[PDB]
Design an enzyme around this catalytic site. Structure first.
Site, PDB file in Angstrom:
ATOM      1  N   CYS A  54       0.844  -1.221   0.000  1.00 35.64           N
ATOM      2  CA  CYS A  54       0.000   0.000   0.000  1.00 35.64           C
ATOM      3  C   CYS A  54       0.865   1.251   0.000  1.00 35.64           C
ATOM      4  O   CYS A  54       0.351   2.287  -0.437  1.00 35.64           O
ATOM      5  CB  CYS A  54      -0.907   0.081   1.216  1.00 35.64           C
ATOM      6  N   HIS A  91      -0.932  13.353  14.145  1.00 41.55           N
ATOM      7  CA  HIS A  91      -1.538  12.587  13.013  1.00 41.55           C
ATOM      8  C   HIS A  91      -0.740  11.306  12.777  1.00 41.55           C
ATOM      9  O   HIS A  91       0.508  11.416  12.599  1.00 41.55           O
ATOM     10  CB  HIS A  91      -1.558  13.468  11.743  1.00 41.55           C
ATOM     11  N   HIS A  94      -4.954   6.972   8.646  1.00 41.06           N
ATOM     12  CA  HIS A  94      -6.334   6.426   8.676  1.00 41.06           C
ATOM     13  C   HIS A  94      -6.379   4.893   8.831  1.00 41.06           C
ATOM     14  O   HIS A  94      -5.324   4.236   8.644  1.00 41.06           O
ATOM     15  CB  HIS A  94      -7.059   6.858   7.415  1.00 41.06           C
ATOM     16  N   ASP A  98     -10.510  -3.257   4.865  1.00 41.20           N
ATOM     17  CA  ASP A  98      -9.979  -4.154   3.816  1.00 41.20           C
ATOM     18  C   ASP A  98      -8.802  -4.997   4.342  1.00 41.20           C
ATOM     19  O   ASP A  98      -8.090  -5.568   3.493  1.00 41.20           O
ATOM     20  CB  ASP A  98      -9.530  -3.292   2.643  1.00 41.20           C
ATOM     21  N   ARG A 107      -7.466  -2.192   8.702  1.00 40.10           N
ATOM     22  CA  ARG A 107      -6.138  -1.839   8.148  1.00 40.10           C
ATOM     23  C   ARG A 107      -5.693  -0.484   8.698  1.00 40.10           C
ATOM     24  O   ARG A 107      -6.168   0.508   8.163  1.00 40.10           O
ATOM     25  CB  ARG A 107      -6.209  -1.785   6.622  1.00 40.10           C
ATOM     26  N   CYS A 109      -3.397   1.885   8.309  1.00 40.21           N
ATOM     27  CA  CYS A 109      -2.376   2.466   7.396  1.00 40.21           C
ATOM     28  C   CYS A 109      -1.723   3.721   8.020  1.00 40.21           C
ATOM     29  O   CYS A 109      -2.190   4.841   7.715  1.00 40.21           O
ATOM     30  CB  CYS A 109      -3.007   2.763   6.043  1.00 40.21           C
TER      31      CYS A 109
END
Length: 134
Positions: A54, A91, A94, A98, A107, A109
């Protein structure tokens, strides 16, 4: 802890996103924990990570569910679930549905400019010791 790279700061502080693949903990799979680059407070482990081709470190759950605040993210004509540091309020990125279907199917990420890895072998040394699972 806030004399950190323009991109360490951009991401954590200014809600930025690092390039994919051109990031540290993408392909990294060493055994130890990943911590908020700012707070130092542990956000994920190493056994709960995987290959999502990804472009960014992906994880199946969080170390301590009661330790990341998930926000709705209306950014960029989209809905979404942002993942930030409760502790440092910076931060991470997200979460998505999936994931591998037989871990969490979630997930996480996460951006690498908001994590510093800590190796398993230097844990009962830098005052996370407690964190021995496995």
């Amino acid at each position: 802890k806030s004399e950190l790279t323009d991109i360490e700061y951009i991401v954590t502080q200014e809600n930025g996103t690092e390039p994919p693949f051109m990031n540290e903990y993408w392909n990294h799979f060493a055994k130890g924990i990943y911590v908020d680059k700012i707070s130092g407070k542990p956000l994920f482990t190493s056994e709960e990570k995987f290959h999502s081709e990804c472009g960014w470190p992906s994880f199946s759950k969080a170390l301590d569910d009661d330790e990341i605040i998930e926000l709705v993210d209306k950014s960029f004509g989209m809905v979404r679930t942002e993942v930030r540091s409760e502790e440092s309020n910076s931060h991470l990125g997200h979460v998505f549905n999936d994931g591998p279907k037989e871990s969490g199917g979630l997930r996480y990420c996460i951006n690498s400019a908001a994590i510093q890895f800590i190796p398993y072998e230097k844990l009962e040394e830098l005052g996370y010791g407690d964190l021995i699972s496995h």
